[PDB]
Design a binder for this molecule. Structure first.
Ligand SMILES: C=CC/C(=C\COP(=O)(O)OP(=O)(O)O)CO
Length: 187
């Protein structure tokens, strides 16, 4: 459909690979750096400045300061996941609420069937069909971050008219221990 035929004409396909130096020590990044899982217990890793030490987050390796970009994430049958973008300068040490005011523009799924945007306060989304693959779209200049069901092209949510000033990274968060990983589709 139009989603597949037009996406690359409007947005540059980003080749997103996960940065293991950023990942909370309870997360495992796959060898190909496209997939993340959770461990039962935190692994023994350095508390280097780029690493999230409280939130169960990991970033892409590259950030964006201009332009239109997109990437796609296979969420599959996971019961919990959150994805989107965040500012380079978010607080990675200690707790902050993941909200736009704190530099995070994310949405996702909790408790198997509760879709939300991570706003303040959180907003519930009503999705006709549960997505298995989600497209994340950034237009830096217009300030729009938009999420689509990447199989049927349906709209999930858009953060409108944000005034970005910092570089933006893809961000991924998983809280639960489940058999299915969260995985980036290669460009
Ligand atoms: C270690 C805390 C669990 C965690 C996130 C939960 O944060 P939260 O209670 O503010 O909930 P929410 O961000 O609304 O899902 C790791 O990213």
């Amino acid at each position: 459909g139009a989603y597949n035929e037009w996406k690359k004409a409007l947005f540059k396909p980003a080749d997103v690979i996960l940065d293991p130096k950023t990942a909370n020590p309870i997360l495992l990044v796959s060898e190909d750096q496209r997939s993340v899982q959770r461990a039962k217990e935190p692994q023994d890793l350095p508390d280097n400045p780029e690493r999230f030490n409280w939130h169960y987050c990991v970033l892409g390796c590259e950030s964006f300061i201009s332009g239109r970009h997109y990437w796609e994430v296979e969420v599959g049958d996971r019961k919990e996941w959150h994805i989107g973008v965040c500012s380079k300068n978010v607080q990675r040490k200690g707790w902050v609420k993941m909200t736009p005011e704190n530099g995070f523009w994310t949405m996702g799924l909790t408790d198997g069937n509760k879709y939300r945007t991570l706003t303040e306060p959180r907003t519930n989304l009503k999705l006709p069909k549960p997505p298995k693959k989600v497209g994340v779209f950034l237009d830096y200049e217009t300030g729009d971050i938009s999420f689509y069901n990447a199989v049927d092209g349906s709209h999930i949510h858009t953060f409108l008219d944000v005034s970005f000033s910092e570089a933006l990274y893809p961000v991924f968060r998983i809280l639960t221990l489940e058999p299915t990983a969260l995985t980036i589709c290669p460009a």
